[PDB]
mmCIF file of C-alpha atoms and ligand atoms in Angstrom:
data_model
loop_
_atom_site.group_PDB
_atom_site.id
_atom_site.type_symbol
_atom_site.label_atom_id
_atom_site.label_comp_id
_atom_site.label_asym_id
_atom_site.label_seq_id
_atom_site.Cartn_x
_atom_site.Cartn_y
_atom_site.Cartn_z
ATOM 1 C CA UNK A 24 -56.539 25.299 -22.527
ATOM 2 C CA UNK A 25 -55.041 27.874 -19.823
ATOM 3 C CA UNK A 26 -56.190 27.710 -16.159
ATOM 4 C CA UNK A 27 -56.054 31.644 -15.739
ATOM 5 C CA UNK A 28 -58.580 32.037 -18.372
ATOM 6 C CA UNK A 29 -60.719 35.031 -17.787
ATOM 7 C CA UNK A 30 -63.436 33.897 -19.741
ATOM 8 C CA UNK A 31 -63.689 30.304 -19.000
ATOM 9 C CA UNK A 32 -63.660 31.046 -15.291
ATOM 10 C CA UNK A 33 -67.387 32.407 -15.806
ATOM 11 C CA UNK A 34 -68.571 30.702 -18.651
ATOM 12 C CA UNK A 35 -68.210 27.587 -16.152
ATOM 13 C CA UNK A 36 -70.417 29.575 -13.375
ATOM 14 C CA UNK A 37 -72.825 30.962 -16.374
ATOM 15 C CA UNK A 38 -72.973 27.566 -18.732
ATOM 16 C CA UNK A 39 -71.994 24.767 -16.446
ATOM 17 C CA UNK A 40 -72.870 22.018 -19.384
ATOM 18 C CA UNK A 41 -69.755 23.855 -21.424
ATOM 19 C CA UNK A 42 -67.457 24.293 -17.856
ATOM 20 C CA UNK A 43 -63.798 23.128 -18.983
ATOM 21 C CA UNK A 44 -61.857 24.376 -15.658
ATOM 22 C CA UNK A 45 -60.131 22.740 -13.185
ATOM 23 C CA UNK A 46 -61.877 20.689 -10.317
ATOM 24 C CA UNK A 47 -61.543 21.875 -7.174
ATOM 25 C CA UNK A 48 -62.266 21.094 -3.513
ATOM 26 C CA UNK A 49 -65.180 23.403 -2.316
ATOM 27 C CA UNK A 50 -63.767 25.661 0.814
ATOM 28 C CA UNK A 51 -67.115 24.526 3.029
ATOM 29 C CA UNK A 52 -65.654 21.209 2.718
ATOM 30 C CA UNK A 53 -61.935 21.907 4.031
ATOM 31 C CA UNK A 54 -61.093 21.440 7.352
ATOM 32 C CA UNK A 55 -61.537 25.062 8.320
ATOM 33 C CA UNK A 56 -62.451 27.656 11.551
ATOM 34 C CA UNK A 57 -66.017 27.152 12.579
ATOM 35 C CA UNK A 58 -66.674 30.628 11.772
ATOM 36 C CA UNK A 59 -65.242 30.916 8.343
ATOM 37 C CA UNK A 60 -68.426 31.504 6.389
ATOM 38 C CA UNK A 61 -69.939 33.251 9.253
ATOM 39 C CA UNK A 62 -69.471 36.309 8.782
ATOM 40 C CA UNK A 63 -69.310 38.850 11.643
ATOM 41 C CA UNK B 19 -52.563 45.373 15.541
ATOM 42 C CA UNK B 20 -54.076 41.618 14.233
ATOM 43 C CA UNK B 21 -51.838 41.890 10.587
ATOM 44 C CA UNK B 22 -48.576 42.182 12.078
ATOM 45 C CA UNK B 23 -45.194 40.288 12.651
ATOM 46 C CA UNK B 24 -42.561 41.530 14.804
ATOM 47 C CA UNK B 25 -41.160 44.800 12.409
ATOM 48 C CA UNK B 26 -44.226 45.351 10.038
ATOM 49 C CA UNK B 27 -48.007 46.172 10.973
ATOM 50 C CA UNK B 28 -50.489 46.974 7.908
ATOM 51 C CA UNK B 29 -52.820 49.062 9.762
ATOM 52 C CA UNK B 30 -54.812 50.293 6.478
ATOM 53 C CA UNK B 31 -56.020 48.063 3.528
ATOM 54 C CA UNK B 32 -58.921 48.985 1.502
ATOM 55 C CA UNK B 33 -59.922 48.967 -2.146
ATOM 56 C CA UNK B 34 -62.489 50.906 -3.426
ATOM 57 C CA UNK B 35 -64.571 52.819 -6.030
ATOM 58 C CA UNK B 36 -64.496 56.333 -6.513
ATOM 59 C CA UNK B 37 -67.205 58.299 -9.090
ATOM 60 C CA UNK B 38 -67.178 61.495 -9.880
ATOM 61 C CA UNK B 39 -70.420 62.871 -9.757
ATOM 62 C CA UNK B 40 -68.830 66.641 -10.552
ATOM 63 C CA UNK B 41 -65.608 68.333 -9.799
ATOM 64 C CA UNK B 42 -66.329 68.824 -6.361
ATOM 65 C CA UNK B 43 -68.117 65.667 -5.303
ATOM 66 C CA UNK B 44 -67.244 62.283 -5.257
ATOM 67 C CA UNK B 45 -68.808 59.166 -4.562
ATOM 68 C CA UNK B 46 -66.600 56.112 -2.638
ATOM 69 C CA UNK B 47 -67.921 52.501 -2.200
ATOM 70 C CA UNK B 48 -65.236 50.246 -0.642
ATOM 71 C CA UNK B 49 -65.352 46.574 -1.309
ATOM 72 C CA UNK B 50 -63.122 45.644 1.367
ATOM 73 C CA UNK B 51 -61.430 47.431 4.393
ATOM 74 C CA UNK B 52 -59.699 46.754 6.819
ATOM 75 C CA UNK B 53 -58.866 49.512 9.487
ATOM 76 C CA UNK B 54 -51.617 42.450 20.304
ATOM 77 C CA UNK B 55 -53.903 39.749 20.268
ATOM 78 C CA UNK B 56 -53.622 35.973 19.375
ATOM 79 C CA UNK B 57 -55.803 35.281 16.394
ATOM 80 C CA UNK B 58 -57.567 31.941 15.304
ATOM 81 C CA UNK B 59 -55.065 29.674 13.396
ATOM 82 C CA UNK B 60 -54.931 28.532 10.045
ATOM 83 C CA UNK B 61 -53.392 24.915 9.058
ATOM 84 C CA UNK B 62 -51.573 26.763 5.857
ATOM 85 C CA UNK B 63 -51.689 23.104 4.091
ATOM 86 C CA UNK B 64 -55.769 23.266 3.569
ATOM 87 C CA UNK B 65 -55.028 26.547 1.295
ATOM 88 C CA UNK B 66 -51.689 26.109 -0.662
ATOM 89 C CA UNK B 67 -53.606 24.705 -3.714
ATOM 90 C CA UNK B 68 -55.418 28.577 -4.016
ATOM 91 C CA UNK B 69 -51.533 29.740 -4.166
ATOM 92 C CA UNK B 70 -48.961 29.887 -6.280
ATOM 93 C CA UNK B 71 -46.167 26.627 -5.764
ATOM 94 C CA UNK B 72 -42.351 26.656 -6.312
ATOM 95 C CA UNK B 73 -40.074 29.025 -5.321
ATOM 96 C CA UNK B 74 -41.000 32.116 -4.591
ATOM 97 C CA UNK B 75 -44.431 30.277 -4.025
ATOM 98 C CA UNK B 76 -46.532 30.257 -0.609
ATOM 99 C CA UNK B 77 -44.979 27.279 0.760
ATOM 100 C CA UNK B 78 -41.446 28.661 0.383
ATOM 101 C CA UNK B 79 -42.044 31.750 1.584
ATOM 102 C CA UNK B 80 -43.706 29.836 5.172
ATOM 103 C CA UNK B 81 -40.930 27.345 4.729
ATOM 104 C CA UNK B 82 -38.021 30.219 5.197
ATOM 105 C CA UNK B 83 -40.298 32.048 7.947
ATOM 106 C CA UNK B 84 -40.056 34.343 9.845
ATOM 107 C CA UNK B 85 -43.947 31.838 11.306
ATOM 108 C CA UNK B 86 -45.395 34.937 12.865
ATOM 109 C CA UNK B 87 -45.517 37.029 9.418
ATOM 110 C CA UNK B 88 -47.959 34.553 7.308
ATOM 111 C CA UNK B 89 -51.638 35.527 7.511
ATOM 112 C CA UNK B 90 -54.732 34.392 6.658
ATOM 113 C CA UNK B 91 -57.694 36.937 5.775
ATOM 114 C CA UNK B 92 -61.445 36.118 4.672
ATOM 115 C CA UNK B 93 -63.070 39.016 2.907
ATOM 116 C CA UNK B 94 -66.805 39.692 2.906
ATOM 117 C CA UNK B 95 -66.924 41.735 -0.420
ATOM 118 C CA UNK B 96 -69.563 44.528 -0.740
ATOM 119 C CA UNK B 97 -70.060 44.637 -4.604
ATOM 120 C CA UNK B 98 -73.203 46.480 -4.146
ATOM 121 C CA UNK B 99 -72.269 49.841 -6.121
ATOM 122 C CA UNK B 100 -72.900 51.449 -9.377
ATOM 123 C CA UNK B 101 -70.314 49.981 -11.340
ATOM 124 C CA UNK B 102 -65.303 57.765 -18.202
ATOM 125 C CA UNK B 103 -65.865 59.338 -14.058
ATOM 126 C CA UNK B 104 -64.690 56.096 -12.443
ATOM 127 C CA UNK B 105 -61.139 55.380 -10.438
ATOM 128 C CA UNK B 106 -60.700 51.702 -8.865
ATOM 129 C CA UNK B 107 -57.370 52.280 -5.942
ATOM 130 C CA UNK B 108 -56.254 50.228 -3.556
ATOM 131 C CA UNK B 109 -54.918 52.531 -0.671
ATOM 132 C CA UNK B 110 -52.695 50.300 2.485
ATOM 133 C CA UNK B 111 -50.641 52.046 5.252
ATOM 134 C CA UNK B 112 -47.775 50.372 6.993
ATOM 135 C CA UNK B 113 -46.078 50.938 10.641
ATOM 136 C CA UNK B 114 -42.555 49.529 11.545
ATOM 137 C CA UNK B 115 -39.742 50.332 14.494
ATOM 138 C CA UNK B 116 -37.422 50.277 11.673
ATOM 139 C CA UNK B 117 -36.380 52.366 8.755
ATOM 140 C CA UNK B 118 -36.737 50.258 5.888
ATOM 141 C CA UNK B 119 -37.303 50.610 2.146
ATOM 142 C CA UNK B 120 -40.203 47.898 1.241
ATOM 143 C CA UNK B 121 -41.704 45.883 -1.489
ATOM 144 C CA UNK B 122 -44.956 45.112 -1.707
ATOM 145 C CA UNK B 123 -45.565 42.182 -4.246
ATOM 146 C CA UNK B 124 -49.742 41.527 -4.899
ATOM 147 C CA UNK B 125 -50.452 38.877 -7.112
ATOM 148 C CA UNK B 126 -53.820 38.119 -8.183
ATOM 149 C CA UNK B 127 -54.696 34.150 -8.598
ATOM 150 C CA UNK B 128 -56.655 31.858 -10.292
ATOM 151 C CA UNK B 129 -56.926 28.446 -9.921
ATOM 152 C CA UNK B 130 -53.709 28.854 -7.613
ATOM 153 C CA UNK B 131 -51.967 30.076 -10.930
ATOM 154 C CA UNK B 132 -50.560 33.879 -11.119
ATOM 155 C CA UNK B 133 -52.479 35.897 -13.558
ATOM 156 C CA UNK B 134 -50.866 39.208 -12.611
ATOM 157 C CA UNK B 135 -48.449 40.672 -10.108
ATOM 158 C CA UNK B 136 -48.347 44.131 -9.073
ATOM 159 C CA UNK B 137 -45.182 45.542 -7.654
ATOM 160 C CA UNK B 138 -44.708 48.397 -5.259
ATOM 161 C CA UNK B 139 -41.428 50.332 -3.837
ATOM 162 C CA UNK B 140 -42.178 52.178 -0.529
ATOM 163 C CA UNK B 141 -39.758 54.753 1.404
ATOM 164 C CA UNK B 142 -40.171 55.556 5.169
ATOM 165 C CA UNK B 143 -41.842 58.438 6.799
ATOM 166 C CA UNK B 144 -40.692 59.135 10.442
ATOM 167 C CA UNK B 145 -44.602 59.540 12.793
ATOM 168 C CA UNK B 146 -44.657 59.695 16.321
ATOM 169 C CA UNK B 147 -41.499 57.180 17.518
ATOM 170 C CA UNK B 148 -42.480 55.014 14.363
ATOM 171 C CA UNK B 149 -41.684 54.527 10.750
ATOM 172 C CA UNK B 150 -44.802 54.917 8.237
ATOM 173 C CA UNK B 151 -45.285 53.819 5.013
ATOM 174 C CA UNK B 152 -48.597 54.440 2.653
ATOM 175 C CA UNK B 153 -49.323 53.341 -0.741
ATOM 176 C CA UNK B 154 -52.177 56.273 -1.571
ATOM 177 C CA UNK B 155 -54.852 55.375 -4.033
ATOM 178 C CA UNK B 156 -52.530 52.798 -6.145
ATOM 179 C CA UNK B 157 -54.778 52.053 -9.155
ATOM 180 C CA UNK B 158 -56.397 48.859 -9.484
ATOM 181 C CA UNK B 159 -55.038 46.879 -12.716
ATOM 182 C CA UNK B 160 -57.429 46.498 -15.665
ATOM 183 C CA UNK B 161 -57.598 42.188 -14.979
ATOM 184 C CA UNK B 162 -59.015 43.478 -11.243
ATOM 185 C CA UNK B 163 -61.150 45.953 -12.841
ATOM 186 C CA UNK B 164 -62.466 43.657 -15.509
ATOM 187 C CA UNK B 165 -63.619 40.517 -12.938
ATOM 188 C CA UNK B 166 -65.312 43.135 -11.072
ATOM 189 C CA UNK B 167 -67.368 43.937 -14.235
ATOM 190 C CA UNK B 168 -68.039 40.258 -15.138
ATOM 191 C CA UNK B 169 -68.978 39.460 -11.075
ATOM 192 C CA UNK B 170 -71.590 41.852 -11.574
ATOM 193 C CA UNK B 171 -73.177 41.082 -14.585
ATOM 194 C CA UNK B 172 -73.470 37.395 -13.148
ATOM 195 C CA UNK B 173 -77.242 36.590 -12.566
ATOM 196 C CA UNK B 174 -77.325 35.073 -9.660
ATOM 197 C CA UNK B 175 -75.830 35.980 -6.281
ATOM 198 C CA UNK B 176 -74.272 32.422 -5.567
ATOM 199 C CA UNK B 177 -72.860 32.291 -8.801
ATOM 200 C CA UNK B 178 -70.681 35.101 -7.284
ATOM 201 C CA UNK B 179 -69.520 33.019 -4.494
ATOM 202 C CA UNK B 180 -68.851 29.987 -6.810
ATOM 203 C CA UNK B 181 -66.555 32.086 -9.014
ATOM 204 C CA UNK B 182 -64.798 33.651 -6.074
ATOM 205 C CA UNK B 183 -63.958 30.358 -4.698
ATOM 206 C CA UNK B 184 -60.635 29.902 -7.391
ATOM 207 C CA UNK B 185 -59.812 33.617 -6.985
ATOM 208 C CA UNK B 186 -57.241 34.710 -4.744
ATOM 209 C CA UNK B 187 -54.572 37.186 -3.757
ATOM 210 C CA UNK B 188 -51.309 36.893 -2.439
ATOM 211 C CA UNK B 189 -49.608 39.953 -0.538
ATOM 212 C CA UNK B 190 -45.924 39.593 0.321
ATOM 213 C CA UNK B 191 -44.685 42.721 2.130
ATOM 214 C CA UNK B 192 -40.332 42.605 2.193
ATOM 215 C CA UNK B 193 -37.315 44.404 3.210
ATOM 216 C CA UNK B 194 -36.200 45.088 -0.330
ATOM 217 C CA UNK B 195 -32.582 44.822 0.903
ATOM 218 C CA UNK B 196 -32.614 41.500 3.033
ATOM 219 C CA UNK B 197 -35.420 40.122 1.454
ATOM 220 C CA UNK B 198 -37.032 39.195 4.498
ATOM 221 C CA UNK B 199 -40.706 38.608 4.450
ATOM 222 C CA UNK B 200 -42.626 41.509 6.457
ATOM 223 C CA UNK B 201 -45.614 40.504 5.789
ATOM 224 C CA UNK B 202 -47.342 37.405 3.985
ATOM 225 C CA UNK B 203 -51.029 38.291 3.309
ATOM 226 C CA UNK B 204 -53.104 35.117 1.535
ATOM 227 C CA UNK B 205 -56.695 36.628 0.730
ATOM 228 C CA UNK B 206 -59.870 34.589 0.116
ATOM 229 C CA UNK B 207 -63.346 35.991 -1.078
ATOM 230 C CA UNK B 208 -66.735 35.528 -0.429
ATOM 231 C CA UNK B 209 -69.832 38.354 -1.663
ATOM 232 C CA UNK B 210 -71.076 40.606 1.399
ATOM 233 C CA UNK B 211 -75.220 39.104 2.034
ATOM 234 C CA UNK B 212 -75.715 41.117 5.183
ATOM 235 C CA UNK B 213 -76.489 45.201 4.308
ATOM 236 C CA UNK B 214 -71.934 45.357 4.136
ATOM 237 C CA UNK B 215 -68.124 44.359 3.741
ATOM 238 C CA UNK B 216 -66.353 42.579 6.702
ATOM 239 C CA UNK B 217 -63.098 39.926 7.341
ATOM 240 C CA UNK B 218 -61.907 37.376 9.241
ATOM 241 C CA UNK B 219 -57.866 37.319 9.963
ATOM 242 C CA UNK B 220 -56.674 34.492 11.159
ATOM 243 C CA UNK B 221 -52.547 33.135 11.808
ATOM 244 C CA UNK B 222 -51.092 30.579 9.247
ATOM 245 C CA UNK B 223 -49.635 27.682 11.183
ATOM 246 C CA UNK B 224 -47.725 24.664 9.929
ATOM 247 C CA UNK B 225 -50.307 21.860 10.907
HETATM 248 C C1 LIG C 317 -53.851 44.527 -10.046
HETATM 249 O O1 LIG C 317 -53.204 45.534 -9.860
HETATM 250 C C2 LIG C 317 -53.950 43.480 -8.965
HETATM 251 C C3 LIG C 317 -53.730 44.064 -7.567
HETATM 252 C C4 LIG C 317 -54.888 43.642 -6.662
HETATM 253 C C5 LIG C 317 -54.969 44.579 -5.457
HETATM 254 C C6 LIG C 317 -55.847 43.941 -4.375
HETATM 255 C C7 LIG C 317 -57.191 44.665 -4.300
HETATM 256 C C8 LIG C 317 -58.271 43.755 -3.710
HETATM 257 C C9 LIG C 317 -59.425 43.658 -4.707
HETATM 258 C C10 LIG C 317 -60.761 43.565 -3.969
HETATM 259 C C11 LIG C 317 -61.515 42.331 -4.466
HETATM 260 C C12 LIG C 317 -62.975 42.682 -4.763
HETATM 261 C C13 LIG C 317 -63.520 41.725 -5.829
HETATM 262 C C14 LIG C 317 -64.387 40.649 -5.169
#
């Protein structure tokens, strides 16, 4: 596999059942500024 | 000035679409622009994952400093646009006390991994008691051009946000003599809801 993967980056998006990426830690769920996905 | 340490301020950063409708008119969408006081900080440990590690990487380039060079910035991107007549550029303009030549390193992430790096040289221009330095409509690379295509064509708008969450971009402005860092711009993405594009900056801090 290769992480920078142009295709595979969408495909998980598009056709989550086939998703073979990384797993990551969703940004709304960091400890981040109140306003962060507020936008102004 | 918000993007600025104490001898570089990026006044100008915007990339864009330009179509030409005929020789004589052109049509430019921007997907994001930007264009003295404390900002909202950052604790640079909650992103360093979406960034490239080692050396060279994000954390050591905030590990040799200069602190006060190392922003954050949250882009709003407006991808509503009609996407053979077509030019995707990336213009930025620069302001300094000093007479430098700089580099200006942009590397495009994913999954905190570099896919591709883009690297400019920029001479001095003397303005009004200040140095200035522009890089004018610098052509966005095919891999830029190509994710634009494929955000597009996804279905759904939240799909767009869920892609853009492990894509990134790294900006590291330097003196391309002493190799100090100028400027350290980290860039996160989310699409633009509200009809257009906007940003948050905020300061990277230790903790
Ligand atoms: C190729 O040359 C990579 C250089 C990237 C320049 C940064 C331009 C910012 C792109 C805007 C993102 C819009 C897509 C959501």
């Amino acid at each position: 596999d290769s992480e920078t993967d142009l295709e595979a980056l969408f495909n998980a998006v598009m056709n989550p059942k086939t998703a073979n990426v990384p797993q990551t830690v969703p940004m709304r769920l960091r400890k981040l500024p109140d306003a962060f996905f507020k936008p102004p | 000035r918000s993007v600025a340490s104490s001898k570089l301020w990026m006044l100008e950063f915007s990339a864009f679409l330009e179509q030409q409708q005929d020789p004589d008119t052109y049509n430019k969408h921007l997907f994001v622009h930007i264009g003295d006081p404390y900002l909202e900080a950052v604790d640079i440990r909650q992103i360093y994952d979406k960034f490239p590690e080692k050396k060279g990487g994000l954390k050591d380039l905030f590990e040799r400093g200069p602190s006060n060079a190392f922003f954050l910035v949250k882009f709003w991107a407006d991808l509503n646009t009609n996407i053979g007549s077509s030019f995707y550029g990336v213009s930025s303009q620069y302001e300094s006390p000093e007479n430098m030549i700089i580099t200006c390193s942009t590397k495009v992430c994913s999954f905190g991994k570099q896919v591709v790096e883009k690297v400019e040289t920029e001479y001095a221009r003397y303005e009004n008691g200040h140095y200035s330095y522009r890089i004018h409509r610098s052509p966005l690379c095919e891999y830029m051009i190509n994710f634009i295509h494929k955000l597009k064509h996804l279905p759904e708008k939240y799909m767009m946000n869920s892609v853009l969450e492990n894509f990134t971009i790294l900006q590291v402005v330097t003196n391309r003599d002493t190799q100090e860092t100028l400027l350290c711009i980290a860039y996160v993405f989310e699409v633009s809801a509200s009809e257009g594009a906007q940003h948050h900056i905020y300061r990277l801090v230790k903790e």
